[PDB]
Amino acid sequence: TQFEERHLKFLQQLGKGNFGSVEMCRYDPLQDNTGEVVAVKKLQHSTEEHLRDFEREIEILKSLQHDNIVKYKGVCYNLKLIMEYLPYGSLRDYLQKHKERIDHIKLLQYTSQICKGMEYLGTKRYIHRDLATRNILVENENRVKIGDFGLTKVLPQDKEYYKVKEPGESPIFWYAPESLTESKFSVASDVWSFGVVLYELFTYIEKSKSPPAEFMRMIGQMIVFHLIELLKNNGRLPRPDGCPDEIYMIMTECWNNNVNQRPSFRDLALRVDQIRDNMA
Numbered sequence: 001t002q003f004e005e006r007h008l009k010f011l012q013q014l015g016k017g018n019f020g021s022v023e024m025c026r027y028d029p030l031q032d033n034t035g036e037v038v039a040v041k042k043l044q045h046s047t048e049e050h051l052r053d054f055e056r057e058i059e060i061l062k063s064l065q066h067d068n069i070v071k072y073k074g075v076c077y078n079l080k081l082i083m084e085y086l087p088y089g090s091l092r093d094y095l096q097k098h099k100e101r102i103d104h105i106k107l108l109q110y111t112s113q114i115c116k117g118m119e120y121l122g123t124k125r126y127i128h129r130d131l132a133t134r135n136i137l138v139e140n141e142n143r144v145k146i147g148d149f150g151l152t153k154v155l156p157q158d159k160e161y162y163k164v165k166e167p168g169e170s171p172i173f174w175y176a177p178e179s180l181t182e183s184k185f186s187v188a189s190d191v192w193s194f195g196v197v198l199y200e201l202f203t204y205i206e207k208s209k210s211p212p213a214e215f216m217r218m219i220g221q222m223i224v225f226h227l228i229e230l231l232k233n234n235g236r237l238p239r240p241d242g243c244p245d246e247i248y249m250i251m252t253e254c255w256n257n258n259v260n261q262r263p264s265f266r267d268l269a270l271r272v273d274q275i276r277d278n279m280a
Protein backbone atom coordinates (compact mmCIF):
# COMPACT_ATOMS: atom_id res chain seq x y z
CA THR A 1 0.00 0.00 0.00
CA GLN A 2 3.08 2.24 -0.43
CA PHE A 3 3.57 3.03 -4.11
CA GLU A 4 6.81 4.40 -5.50
CA GLU A 5 6.47 7.59 -7.54
CA ARG A 6 9.19 6.51 -9.97
CA HIS A 7 7.07 3.48 -11.03
CA LEU A 8 3.82 5.40 -11.80
CA LYS A 9 3.54 6.01 -15.52
CA PHE A 10 1.14 8.78 -16.54
CA LEU A 11 -1.51 7.80 -19.14
CA GLN A 12 -4.18 10.46 -19.07
CA GLN A 13 -5.92 13.11 -17.03
CA LEU A 14 -9.31 11.79 -15.76
CA GLY A 15 -10.72 14.92 -14.23
CA LYS A 16 -10.47 17.86 -11.87
CA GLY A 17 -12.89 18.79 -8.99
CA ASN A 18 -12.87 20.36 -5.47
CA PHE A 19 -9.07 21.23 -5.55
CA GLY A 20 -8.19 17.58 -6.44
CA SER A 21 -7.07 16.09 -9.76
CA VAL A 22 -7.18 12.46 -10.89
CA GLU A 23 -4.99 10.65 -13.42
CA MET A 24 -4.97 7.24 -15.04
CA CYS A 25 -1.50 5.73 -14.44
CA ARG A 26 0.13 2.35 -14.87
CA TYR A 27 1.95 1.22 -11.77
CA ASP A 28 4.80 -0.73 -13.35
CA PRO A 29 7.57 -1.39 -10.80
CA LEU A 30 9.12 -4.12 -13.00
CA GLN A 31 9.35 -1.62 -15.88
CA ASP A 32 8.23 -4.37 -18.26
CA ASN A 33 4.73 -3.02 -19.03
CA THR A 34 2.97 -5.68 -16.83
CA GLY A 35 1.74 -3.51 -13.92
CA GLU A 36 -1.90 -2.68 -13.29
CA VAL A 37 -3.60 0.50 -14.35
CA VAL A 38 -4.73 2.54 -11.29
CA ALA A 39 -6.35 5.90 -10.54
CA VAL A 40 -4.19 8.49 -8.86
CA LYS A 41 -5.59 11.51 -7.04
CA LYS A 42 -3.42 14.53 -6.15
CA LEU A 43 -3.93 18.13 -4.97
CA GLN A 44 -4.18 20.67 -7.84
CA HIS A 45 -1.99 22.97 -5.66
CA SER A 46 -0.75 21.84 -2.21
CA THR A 47 -1.60 24.27 0.65
CA GLU A 48 -0.93 23.14 4.24
CA GLU A 49 -4.71 23.51 4.86
CA HIS A 50 -5.56 21.55 1.70
CA LEU A 51 -2.89 18.96 2.58
CA ARG A 52 -4.55 18.36 5.95
CA ASP A 53 -8.02 17.95 4.33
CA PHE A 54 -6.43 15.53 1.84
CA GLU A 55 -4.96 13.43 4.61
CA ARG A 56 -8.37 13.14 6.27
CA GLU A 57 -9.98 12.21 2.91
CA ILE A 58 -7.42 9.40 2.52
CA GLU A 59 -8.22 8.13 6.05
CA ILE A 60 -11.93 8.18 5.28
CA LEU A 61 -11.53 6.22 2.02
CA LYS A 62 -9.20 3.72 3.66
CA SER A 63 -11.77 3.08 6.42
CA LEU A 64 -14.46 2.18 3.84
CA GLN A 65 -14.84 -1.38 2.44
CA HIS A 66 -18.02 -1.86 0.45
CA ASP A 67 -19.01 -3.15 -3.01
CA ASN A 68 -20.40 0.29 -3.88
CA ILE A 69 -17.46 2.40 -2.76
CA VAL A 70 -14.29 2.78 -4.85
CA LYS A 71 -11.36 0.71 -3.47
CA TYR A 72 -8.51 2.39 -1.68
CA LYS A 73 -5.20 0.85 -2.78
CA GLY A 74 -2.57 3.00 -1.03
CA VAL A 75 -0.60 6.22 -1.03
CA CYS A 76 2.47 7.57 -2.80
CA TYR A 77 4.62 10.27 -1.15
CA ASN A 78 3.53 15.55 -2.86
CA LEU A 79 1.00 13.12 -1.34
CA LYS A 80 -0.94 10.91 -3.81
CA LEU A 81 -4.02 8.70 -3.21
CA ILE A 82 -3.97 5.42 -5.21
CA MET A 83 -7.28 3.79 -6.07
CA GLU A 84 -8.58 1.00 -8.29
CA TYR A 85 -9.34 2.22 -11.85
CA LEU A 86 -12.97 1.74 -12.88
CA PRO A 87 -12.99 1.29 -16.65
CA TYR A 88 -16.40 2.77 -17.55
CA GLY A 89 -15.76 6.19 -16.02
CA SER A 90 -18.39 8.47 -14.39
CA LEU A 91 -22.06 7.45 -14.35
CA ARG A 92 -22.84 10.94 -15.60
CA ASP A 93 -20.92 10.26 -18.89
CA TYR A 94 -21.80 6.58 -19.17
CA LEU A 95 -25.57 7.20 -18.82
CA GLN A 96 -25.52 9.99 -21.40
CA LYS A 97 -23.50 7.79 -23.79
CA HIS A 98 -25.77 4.74 -23.43
CA LYS A 99 -29.16 6.40 -22.76
CA GLU A 100 -30.89 4.56 -25.61
CA ARG A 101 -29.76 1.29 -24.12
CA ILE A 102 -30.34 1.78 -20.31
CA ASP A 103 -33.92 1.20 -19.07
CA HIS A 104 -35.69 2.28 -15.86
CA ILE A 105 -35.05 -1.08 -14.25
CA LYS A 106 -31.32 -0.59 -14.78
CA LEU A 107 -31.47 2.97 -13.32
CA LEU A 108 -33.10 1.55 -10.20
CA GLN A 109 -30.39 -1.05 -9.88
CA TYR A 110 -27.82 1.82 -9.85
CA THR A 111 -30.06 3.88 -7.49
CA SER A 112 -30.23 0.94 -5.10
CA GLN A 113 -26.44 0.56 -5.11
CA ILE A 114 -25.93 4.27 -4.43
CA CYS A 115 -28.36 4.05 -1.43
CA LYS A 116 -26.48 1.05 0.01
CA GLY A 117 -23.15 2.82 -0.35
CA MET A 118 -24.62 5.89 1.37
CA GLU A 119 -26.21 3.88 4.18
CA TYR A 120 -22.83 2.40 4.80
CA LEU A 121 -21.25 5.89 5.06
CA GLY A 122 -24.01 6.79 7.51
CA THR A 123 -22.99 3.91 9.79
CA LYS A 124 -19.60 5.59 10.14
CA ARG A 125 -21.23 8.99 10.69
CA TYR A 126 -19.66 10.22 7.46
CA ILE A 127 -21.50 12.99 5.49
CA HIS A 128 -20.57 12.89 1.80
CA ARG A 129 -21.67 16.47 1.00
CA ASP A 130 -21.16 16.19 -2.80
CA LEU A 131 -23.56 13.47 -4.04
CA ALA A 132 -23.94 13.98 -7.81
CA THR A 133 -23.79 11.58 -10.80
CA ARG A 134 -20.40 13.09 -11.70
CA ASN A 135 -19.03 11.54 -8.46
CA ILE A 136 -20.44 8.05 -9.16
CA LEU A 137 -18.25 5.64 -11.16
CA VAL A 138 -19.11 2.60 -13.26
CA GLU A 139 -17.20 -0.61 -12.65
CA ASN A 140 -19.29 -2.65 -15.16
CA GLU A 141 -22.84 -2.56 -16.58
CA ASN A 142 -24.17 -4.12 -13.37
CA ARG A 143 -22.22 -2.18 -10.74
CA VAL A 144 -21.64 1.46 -9.77
CA LYS A 145 -19.57 2.92 -6.87
CA ILE A 146 -19.37 6.22 -5.03
CA GLY A 147 -16.05 7.31 -6.44
CA ASP A 148 -14.95 10.53 -4.72
CA PHE A 149 -14.86 11.71 -1.08
CA GLY A 150 -13.26 15.13 -1.47
CA LEU A 151 -15.90 16.98 0.62
CA THR A 152 -16.73 14.17 3.05
CA LYS A 153 -16.83 15.05 6.82
CA VAL A 154 -17.13 13.06 10.06
CA LEU A 155 -19.99 14.18 12.29
CA PRO A 156 -18.95 15.48 15.71
CA GLN A 157 -19.60 12.83 18.42
CA ASP A 158 -22.42 14.95 19.93
CA LYS A 159 -24.30 16.51 16.97
CA GLU A 160 -26.25 15.23 13.95
CA TYR A 161 -25.01 17.96 11.57
CA TYR A 162 -21.70 19.53 10.74
CA LYS A 163 -21.43 23.23 9.88
CA VAL A 164 -18.81 24.13 7.30
CA LYS A 165 -18.26 26.96 4.85
CA GLU A 166 -15.41 26.49 2.34
CA PRO A 167 -13.87 28.79 -0.21
CA GLY A 168 -14.64 27.73 -3.80
CA GLU A 169 -17.68 27.17 -6.00
CA SER A 170 -20.26 25.12 -4.05
CA PRO A 171 -22.58 22.81 -6.01
CA ILE A 172 -25.59 24.89 -4.82
CA PHE A 173 -28.14 23.27 -7.15
CA TRP A 174 -27.69 19.93 -5.31
CA TYR A 175 -27.79 21.54 -1.79
CA ALA A 176 -30.53 21.21 0.84
CA PRO A 177 -32.07 24.55 1.91
CA GLU A 178 -30.47 24.35 5.37
CA SER A 179 -27.07 23.74 3.71
CA LEU A 180 -27.63 26.96 1.71
CA THR A 181 -29.00 29.03 4.59
CA GLU A 182 -27.09 27.67 7.56
CA SER A 183 -24.11 25.70 6.10
CA LYS A 184 -25.45 22.63 7.93
CA PHE A 185 -24.65 19.21 6.44
CA SER A 186 -26.11 15.93 7.71
CA VAL A 187 -27.32 12.50 6.63
CA ALA A 188 -30.58 14.36 5.83
CA SER A 189 -28.85 16.84 3.46
CA ASP A 190 -27.14 13.82 1.75
CA VAL A 191 -30.70 12.43 1.30
CA TRP A 192 -31.78 15.73 -0.25
CA SER A 193 -28.84 15.56 -2.69
CA PHE A 194 -29.60 11.89 -3.38
CA GLY A 195 -33.02 13.04 -4.60
CA VAL A 196 -31.17 15.32 -7.06
CA VAL A 197 -29.06 12.31 -8.16
CA LEU A 198 -32.29 10.38 -8.77
CA TYR A 199 -33.60 13.31 -10.83
CA GLU A 200 -30.32 13.41 -12.83
CA LEU A 201 -30.62 9.68 -13.59
CA PHE A 202 -34.24 9.89 -14.77
CA THR A 203 -33.49 12.87 -17.03
CA TYR A 204 -30.71 10.73 -18.61
CA ILE A 205 -28.38 13.74 -18.11
CA GLU A 206 -30.24 15.82 -20.73
CA LYS A 207 -28.35 19.13 -20.83
CA SER A 208 -31.34 21.50 -20.95
CA LYS A 209 -32.86 19.51 -18.03
CA SER A 210 -29.86 19.63 -15.65
CA PRO A 211 -30.55 20.92 -12.15
CA PRO A 212 -28.63 24.20 -12.84
CA ALA A 213 -30.57 24.67 -16.13
CA GLU A 214 -34.01 24.04 -14.51
CA PHE A 215 -33.42 26.12 -11.37
CA MET A 216 -31.89 29.04 -13.42
CA ARG A 217 -35.02 28.95 -15.58
CA MET A 218 -37.24 29.14 -12.49
CA ILE A 219 -35.16 32.02 -10.98
CA GLY A 220 -34.98 33.81 -14.39
CA GLN A 221 -24.63 37.30 -8.12
CA MET A 222 -27.61 36.90 -5.77
CA ILE A 223 -28.55 33.52 -7.33
CA VAL A 224 -28.18 31.78 -3.93
CA PHE A 225 -30.63 34.27 -2.35
CA HIS A 226 -33.28 33.50 -4.97
CA LEU A 227 -32.62 29.76 -4.91
CA ILE A 228 -33.27 29.86 -1.17
CA GLU A 229 -36.58 31.70 -1.73
CA LEU A 230 -37.69 29.36 -4.46
CA LEU A 231 -37.11 26.30 -2.25
CA LYS A 232 -38.78 27.84 0.83
CA ASN A 233 -41.71 28.50 -1.54
CA ASN A 234 -41.82 24.82 -2.55
CA GLY A 235 -40.36 25.35 -6.03
CA ARG A 236 -38.88 22.00 -7.12
CA LEU A 237 -37.29 20.31 -10.15
CA PRO A 238 -40.03 18.89 -12.41
CA ARG A 239 -40.86 15.24 -12.96
CA PRO A 240 -38.45 14.07 -15.70
CA ASP A 241 -39.91 12.97 -19.09
CA GLY A 242 -41.01 9.38 -18.76
CA CYS A 243 -40.49 9.28 -14.99
CA PRO A 244 -43.23 7.29 -13.21
CA ASP A 245 -45.16 8.99 -10.39
CA GLU A 246 -43.92 6.59 -7.71
CA ILE A 247 -40.28 7.43 -8.60
CA TYR A 248 -40.95 11.15 -8.75
CA MET A 249 -42.56 10.80 -5.30
CA ILE A 250 -39.27 9.35 -3.96
CA MET A 251 -37.59 12.54 -5.23
CA THR A 252 -40.18 14.90 -3.77
CA GLU A 253 -39.94 13.15 -0.35
CA CYS A 254 -36.12 13.53 -0.37
CA TRP A 255 -36.72 17.19 -1.09
CA ASN A 256 -38.64 17.95 2.15
CA ASN A 257 -37.87 21.40 3.66
CA ASN A 258 -38.30 19.66 7.03
CA VAL A 259 -34.97 18.02 7.67
CA ASN A 260 -36.37 15.39 10.02
CA GLN A 261 -39.07 14.28 7.55
CA ARG A 262 -36.75 13.11 4.77
CA PRO A 263 -36.54 9.30 4.25
CA SER A 264 -33.61 7.26 5.58
CA PHE A 265 -31.21 5.59 3.09
CA ARG A 266 -32.38 2.19 4.35
CA ASP A 267 -35.98 3.08 3.50
CA LEU A 268 -34.91 4.54 0.15
CA ALA A 269 -33.22 1.16 -0.71
CA LEU A 270 -36.39 -0.80 0.33
CA ARG A 271 -38.74 1.33 -1.73
CA VAL A 272 -36.44 1.23 -4.76
CA ASP A 273 -35.93 -2.52 -4.45
CA GLN A 274 -39.71 -3.02 -4.19
CA ILE A 275 -40.46 -0.94 -7.29
CA ARG A 276 -37.67 -2.84 -9.09
CA ASP A 277 -39.35 -6.16 -8.26
CA ASN A 278 -42.78 -4.91 -9.32
CA MET A 279 -41.26 -3.96 -12.71
CA ALA A 280 -39.44 -7.27 -13.24
Ligand SMILES: CNS(=O)(=O)c1ccc(-c2cccc3ncc(-c4cc(OC)c(OC)c(OC)c4)nc23)cc1
Pocket residue numbers: 014015016017018020021022039070083084085086087088089090134135137147148
Ligand atom coordinates in the same frame (compact mmCIF):
# COMPACT_ATOMS: atom_id res chain seq x y z
C1 LIG B 1 -15.80 14.11 -10.84
N1 LIG B 1 -14.65 14.41 -10.00
S1 LIG B 1 -13.16 14.27 -10.61
O1 LIG B 1 -13.32 14.68 -11.98
O2 LIG B 1 -12.26 14.99 -9.78
C2 LIG B 1 -12.81 12.53 -10.46
C3 LIG B 1 -12.12 11.90 -11.51
C4 LIG B 1 -11.79 10.55 -11.42
C5 LIG B 1 -12.19 9.80 -10.27
C6 LIG B 1 -11.86 8.36 -10.12
C7 LIG B 1 -11.51 7.88 -8.83
C8 LIG B 1 -11.17 6.53 -8.63
C9 LIG B 1 -11.21 5.65 -9.72
C10 LIG B 1 -11.57 6.12 -11.00
N2 LIG B 1 -11.59 5.28 -12.05
C11 LIG B 1 -11.92 5.70 -13.28
C12 LIG B 1 -12.25 7.04 -13.48
C13 LIG B 1 -12.61 7.61 -14.80
C14 LIG B 1 -12.38 6.87 -15.97
C15 LIG B 1 -12.69 7.44 -17.23
O3 LIG B 1 -12.52 6.74 -18.42
C16 LIG B 1 -12.60 5.31 -18.49
C17 LIG B 1 -13.21 8.72 -17.31
O4 LIG B 1 -13.49 9.27 -18.55
C18 LIG B 1 -12.46 10.09 -19.16
C19 LIG B 1 -13.42 9.46 -16.14
O5 LIG B 1 -13.95 10.74 -16.27
C20 LIG B 1 -14.35 11.59 -15.16
C21 LIG B 1 -13.09 8.90 -14.89
N3 LIG B 1 -12.20 7.92 -12.44
C22 LIG B 1 -11.86 7.48 -11.20
C23 LIG B 1 -12.90 10.44 -9.23
C24 LIG B 1 -13.20 11.81 -9.32
